[PDB]
Backbone:
């Protein structure tokens, strides 16, 4: 599965490729982002394998929704 976590210093966005859904991160496992699960403003939850808690660049990882 494919998901692209797009990042800014303050901005946090997640692009669910399989749905073409890019939504704002309103709820996080860790105040940064990564750690366990994340929830978009749409209500969708995406799991983070936990690496670079606040990524300084748009990273593409596997999609695993809750």
Residues:
């Amino acid at each position: 599965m494919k998901v692209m976590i797009r990042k800014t210093a303050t901005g946090h966005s997640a692009y669910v490729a399989k749905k073409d859904l890019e939504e704002l991160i309103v709820e996080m496992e860790n105040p940064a982002l990564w750690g366990g699960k994340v929830t978009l403003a749409n209500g969708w939850q995406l799991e983070l394998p936990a690496m670079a808690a606040d990524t300084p660049l748009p990273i593409t990882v596997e999609a695993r929704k809750l």
Notes: Strands lie at 3-7, 12-16, 21-28, 37-40, 45-47, 59-61.
